[PDB]
Structure formats: structure tokens, C-alpha cells
Amino acid sequence: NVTYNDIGGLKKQLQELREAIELPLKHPELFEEVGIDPPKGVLLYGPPGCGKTLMAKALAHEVNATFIRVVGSELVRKYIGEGARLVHELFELAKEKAPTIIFIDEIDAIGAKEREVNRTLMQLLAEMDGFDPRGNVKVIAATNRPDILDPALLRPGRFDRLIEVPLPDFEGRLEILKVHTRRMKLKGVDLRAIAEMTEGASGADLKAIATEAGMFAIRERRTYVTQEDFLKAVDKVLGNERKLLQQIT
Ligand SMILES: Nc1ncnc2c1ncn2[C@@H]1O[C@H](COP(=O)(O)OP(=O)(O)O)[C@@H](O)[C@H]1O
């Protein structure tokens, strides 16, 4: 279960997403009053593990909506017409369960400029065309490779708003570290230091660092968590050791 309080370092990105969906949904009345149709799709982009799915999930909680997630790669099918059918069913289901947030991760797998997948693409855009705003089912897509995308994905009525979800900067990381260490008791711990030593980390790495910290404490049998635990969790999660593994698997 996810809420805005489970998210760190993305204050303006959240506001933007909220302004694009939460705001209209609540007071749609008041948008037509100004001549602006509420967006149908929002595209989130940036490197992996930095909060894109989190924002979409938490947004879904806050508007009390069904949250349906599909990974783009799985809409690529060996057999003809299947990719398109799935997208069709996806949208039917999302109506069945309205209101809903559809979250299509790795939308690049389908929205790249073999030709079957373009069929699959046409279907989705077809689906957005025809949904009609004001507006009960909303789509959120995510990619780490945005520059790839067919611009027909981005025309108005389709993935209008773009929001970059970056690697966390120094303060972001601090915020994120707090989110995932809020429910531990630490004593020796300076998190500014941890934030300083993790340049380039993602939100996920940082969660992993807090997680590896607490278990390090456990394996050395204490009940609290200390700076040393974090210094080695930082060294475990980041750094060659897990690096080579990745090059290895
Ligand atoms: N901005 C963030 N704030 C708090 N936790 C985060 C953040 N970004 C990533 N995480 C942690 O990493 C995990 C993956 O985040 P997710 O939103 O799935 O990343 P992606 O951008 O790959 O969709 C989440 O479960 C979350 O706990």
C-alpha cells in the first residue's frame, strides 16, 4: 500500500502529476470552465528505480482507484494480433473496474519508431482516442528511453504531460533515506553522510542500503542500527562487488 508519504525527493514531480490528474478528477467541474481538457496519459521518464511506479501507485491510492499495471515487454507477443488484443482487454478491464489508473511500464517496448508491435501501438492510441476525458480512466506510462518514442504517442489527447523522474540529487537521497529508515531505530547514524557517499544511486539502491543495514545489525545481533552498518550497506549495494555480479548475471 502506497501513499505520498512513502515517496522522497520528488516534491515538484508529484505536484505536477497531481496537477495533471488528481486535480482535474476531483474538480473536473472547473476545468471545462476554463477550456482545458484534463490529460489522458502522463508520461514519466528517467532511470530505473527512481519512483515512477511509486508516484503512479500513490496517485491511485489517493484518488481511490483501481491500479492496473502492465509491463511493455509482455505486450510483445510471438503470435499475430495478440499484442493488440491484450491492450484492448486491458482497457475494457480498466473500465470494468473504474475508476482506474492504468500504468504501462516500459512503454518503449511498444512505442518505438516487428511491424506487428506497431499494430499493438496503434491499438493503444486507438484506445486513448475514444476514451474521452472528464474522464474516469487515466493512463500513466513510464520509460527509461524516452527519446525513442513515436511522437504520435505524445500528441494532445495522448501522452501530453511529460515529467522527468531523475536520479535523486543530494537532498533527494537524504529524503529517500529518511523514508526507508523511519521505522528503524538507529543511534550512530548521520544520513547526510550516507546521502553524500551515494551519488548516482537510485531510490531503489537507497532502500536496499537501508535494508542491508538493518540485516547487518541483525547478523551482529543488535536491536538498533548504526553508522557502521550503513557504511557497509553502502559498500555492499554500490561498488564493484555487486557491480561484477551484474556483469556476471
Ligand atoms: N523517490 C522515491 N522515494 C522513496 N522510495 C523510492 C523512490 N524511488 C524508488 N524508491 C524505492 O525503490 C523501489 C522501486 O521504485 P519504483 O517507483 O518501482 O521505480 P521505477 O522508477 O523503476 O518505477 C520502490 O519500492 C521504492 O521503495
Side-chain angles (χ1 to χ4, degrees), residues 200-202 204-206 208 212 233-249:
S202 71
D205 293 325
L206 301 171
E212 261 315 271
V234 172
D235 182 81
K236 179 136 72 125
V237 171
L238 330 219
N240 232 225
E241 266 344 319
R242 141 283 137 89
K243 258 214 227 78
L244 306 186
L245 172 77
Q246 276 315 315
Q247 325 224 329
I248 231 181
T249 157

Side-chain angles (χ1 to χ4, degrees), residues 128-159:
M128 326 242 344
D129 306 335
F131 167 57
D132 184 1
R134 241 151 237 137
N136 193 245
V137 177
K138 287 303 155 88
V139 186
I140 295 185
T143 181
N144 328 114
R145 306 146 225 181
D147 284 296
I148 269 178
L149 312 187
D150 186 322
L153 269 184
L154 319 158
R155 318 184 43 213
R158 276 141 210 212
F159 290 100

Side-chain angles (χ1 to χ4, degrees), residues 2 4-10 44-57 69 103 105 142-144 165-166 168 172 175-177 179-180 202-208:
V2 186
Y4 296 137
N5 291 308
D6 301 303
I7 296 179
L10 293 169
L44 308 180
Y45 70 93
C50 293
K52 305 190 241 51
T53 313
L54 273 198
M55 296 166 71
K57 259 174 184 190
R69 138 170 202 286
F103 180 73
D105 207 336
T143 181
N144 328 114
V165 167
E175 268 183 66
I176 291 155
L177 277 163
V179 167
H180 296 278
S202 71
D205 293 325
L206 301 171
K207 164 151 176 196

Side-chain angles (χ1 to χ4, degrees), residues 3-208:
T3 97
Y4 296 137
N5 291 308
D6 301 303
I7 296 179
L10 293 169
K11 179 125 164 301
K12 74 174 161 240
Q13 283 85 6
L14 261 189
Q15 275 171 352
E16 286 175 336
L17 180 56
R18 289 180 96 228
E19 290 182 41
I21 309 231
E22 178 167 334
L23 229 208
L25 259 66
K26 279 139 186 54
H27 316 2
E29 286 162 69
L30 309 106
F31 249 67
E32 158 61 81
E33 184 222 320
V34 110
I36 282 145
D37 292 13
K40 289 227 237 324
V42 175
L43 180 70
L44 308 180
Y45 70 93
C50 293
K52 305 190 241 51
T53 313
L54 273 198
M55 296 166 71
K57 259 174 184 190
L59 182 86
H61 191 95
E62 182 104 337
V63 283
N64 307 121
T66 329
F67 173 82
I68 293 150
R69 138 170 202 286
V70 49
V71 186
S73 62
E74 307 192 313
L75 298 181
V76 185
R77 281 319 161 144
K78 343 195 170 308
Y79 303 124
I80 268 173
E82 215 155 47
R85 207 94 239 176
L86 283 164
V87 176
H88 193 64
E89 325 283 25
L90 176 55
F91 278 91
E92 278 182 332
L93 169 57
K95 297 183 239 178
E96 283 171 51
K97 295 150 102 39
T100 72
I101 304 278
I102 303 187
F103 180 73
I104 301 172
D105 207 336
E106 112 177 286
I107 190 177
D108 45 275
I110 253 71
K113 315 139 317 154
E114 23 148 348
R115 49 296 206 341
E116 169 69 8
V117 325
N118 183 81
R119 291 296 226 264
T120 302
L121 178 51
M122 313 234 65
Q123 187 63 41
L124 164 86
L125 310 172
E127 298 289 350
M128 326 242 344
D129 306 335
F131 167 57
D132 184 1
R134 241 151 237 137
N136 193 245
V137 177
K138 287 303 155 88
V139 186
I140 295 185
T143 181
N144 328 114
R145 306 146 225 181
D147 284 296
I148 269 178
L149 312 187
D150 186 322
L153 269 184
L154 319 158
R155 318 184 43 213
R158 276 141 210 212
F159 290 100
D160 280 355
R161 303 307 192 261
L162 284 179
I163 306 179
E164 184 196 356
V165 167
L167 272 179
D169 62 11
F170 172 81
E171 300 258 19
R173 303 198 294 278
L174 186 48
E175 268 183 66
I176 291 155
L177 277 163
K178 293 186 199 306
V179 167
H180 296 278
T181 63
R182 242 148 44 177
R183 316 188 53 211
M184 312 177 166
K185 200 26 195 182
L186 350 136
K187 293 179 179 179
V189 181
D190 182 336
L191 292 174
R192 283 201 120 75
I194 303 315
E196 199 170 284
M197 290 151 43
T198 50
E199 201 172 329
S202 71
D205 293 325
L206 301 171
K207 164 151 176 196

